[PDB]
Amino acid sequence: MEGVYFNIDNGFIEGVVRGYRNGLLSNNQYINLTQCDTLEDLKLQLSSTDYGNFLSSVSSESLTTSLIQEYASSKLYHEFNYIRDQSSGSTRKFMDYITYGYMIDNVALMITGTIHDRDKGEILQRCHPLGWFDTLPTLSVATDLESLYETVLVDTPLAPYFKELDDMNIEIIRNKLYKAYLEDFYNFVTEEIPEPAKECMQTLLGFEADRRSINIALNSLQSSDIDPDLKSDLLPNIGKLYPLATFHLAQAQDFEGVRAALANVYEYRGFLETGNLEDHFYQLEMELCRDAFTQQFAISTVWAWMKSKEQEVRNITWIAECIAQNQRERINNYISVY
C-alpha cells in the first residue's frame, strides 16, 4: 500500500509540500487580489496570504509587475530547493528530473542570448535558478550545436537527450530536448516511482507531452521549414495522442487535419472547437494538479505543487498587469482551482 513505505523517506517532504499546497491562493484570495486597483493594494492583499512580506524589500514606487513576478517565482524556487535538499534516493532523482526541464530552458536561453549577442552577464542573471548547472555560463562560447554539445552539454544531465544556430534551429533543439526529456522522465516514473504517484505522474507528463504535441502540430502549419519528418522528431511518445493522433499530427498540413486528429481523444476534443487552446491546457493542468493533491502518499504532489505555483505566479502576474495597465475587464482571466 502507498502509505506503508512512503513515509520512511518522504513523510516529512510530503507534509511540507502539502503545507505548500495549503499555501496556494484560494478563489476568495484571488477575488481579493482582483479587487485591487493599485499595485500597492495588490501587495497589501498579497501580504495577507502565504506570500506574506515577500515584497517588503520593495518600495511602493519601485513596485512593478516584473518585480512581483520575480519575487513570487523566487519564493517558489526557494521552496523547491528546500524540498529537494531534504530528498534522497528516488525522490531526489524525481526532483532532479523536475529540474531537467529548467536545464533545457536555460540551455535554450543561453544559446538564444549568444546568437543574439546579448550580454553574457545579463543572460546568466536571467537563467532559471532551478535547472542551473556549473558549465551553464560556458554555453556562450559557441553558436554551433556540435560545439556546445562537446564543450558543455555532454557533461550535463541533458547529454542523453541529444541523441551555425539560428532562432528556428534553437527552437528545434529545445523541442527535441523536451521530447527526449519527457520520454526519459516518463520512463523513470514508470520504473522507479510507486503506484499512485506513478499513475499521477504518467498522466501529468502525458498531458504535458500532449500540450507540446498539439502546439507543435498547430504551429508547424504556419511554417514551411518544419518538414513532416521533423515534426515526428518533435512530438513526444508518451501522451494520450501517442501513437495514433501523434502520427496523424506528424503528417497534417491544415488546421482541419489537426482538429480531426484531436477528435480522436475524448480528453482534448473541444480544445480546438471553442475558446483559446492555451486556456484549455492551463485549465486541464490545474484540474490534473488539483486531482493529484487528492493522493496522500504520492510524490507526484511535488510536481503538482510546482505546476500549481507556476500557474499561481502566472495568475498573480496577470492580475498585476490588469492593475497596472488598467484593463480590469480581463482581470478575471486566470486559472484557479484551489
Add this chain to the structure above:
Amino acid sequence: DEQYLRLIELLSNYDSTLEQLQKGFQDGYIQLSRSNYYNKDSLRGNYGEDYWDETYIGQLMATVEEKNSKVVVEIVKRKKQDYDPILMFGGVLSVPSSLRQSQTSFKGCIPLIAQLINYKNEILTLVETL
C-alpha cells in the same frame, strides 16, 4: 484669417491619431502581458529582453522630405536579415497567439506614429506661421 480654422482641423486630427495610437499601444501592451501569461513555451517565463536580438536590423526605416516649410516624416517597410520580428521570440513554435496579436497591434501603431509625427510638425509649422 482661415489659418486658425486649419489649426483647429489639425488639432482634431492630432487628437484622433493620439486616440488611435493610445488604443493600439494599450492593445499591444495587454496582449504582450497576456503573452507573459501563457509563458509555458517561453525560455524564462517572459517574452521580453530574453529574446531581444541586438543584431536585429528592423523591417522599417524612416524617410524625411521637405516641401515648402512643411517637413514630412514617413515610416516605410524597407531596411536572412530583416526577418519577421516574431522570430526573435521563438515565433515559429514557441509563442502564444497573443504575442502575434500584440505584434499586430504595434505594427498598427507604426502608421499612427508616422501620422502623429506629421500632424505634430504640421501644427508646429502652422503655429509658427501664426
Add this chain to the structure above:
Amino acid sequence: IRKIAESLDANLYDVDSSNEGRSQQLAKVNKNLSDLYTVLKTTSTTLES
C-alpha cells in the same frame, strides 16, 4: 579557449613570450605594484586611523 576560460570567470593575461623576455613585463608589474602599495598604504593608514 579565451572565451571558454573567461566564461569560467578566469582572469586571462598576456605573457610576452615563452622565453625570459617576460622579465621586462615582470619589472613593469613590480613598478606598478610598488606604486600601488604606496597608494594602498596611504589610503589604509587613514582608514585605520
Add this chain to the structure above:
Amino acid sequence: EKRTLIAVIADEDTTTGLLLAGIGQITPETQEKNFFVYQEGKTTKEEITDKFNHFTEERDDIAILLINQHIAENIRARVDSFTNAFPAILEIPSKDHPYDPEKDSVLKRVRKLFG
C-alpha cells in the same frame, strides 16, 4: 537626406513592442545600437540625458526618436530645450503610464497662442 533610422528610448515592454513592430536594434551598416532600454529606478537622469543627446546630436542619421512619455517627463527640461526639427521626437505611451495630454508639448504651444 541621410536621416533614415528610428531611435528608441523606451522601457522593457515598450522596447519589446517596438521590436515586434519591426523597428531595428542597430544601424544596418554601421551596426550602431539605436535603442536605449530605460530601466525604472536603476537608470538615472544622466544616462537618459546622454542618450537623448546621442540620438539627437551626435547621430546624423536618426530621423525619428521614439521616447516613452514618462521618460520624456523625467527629462522634460532637456526635451523641451531641444529645438532642431531634423530628428522628429514623438512621445509614446508606456505599458503602465498612458499618454498624458498634460505633458504634451504641442498643446502647450497652442496654449501659447492663446487661441
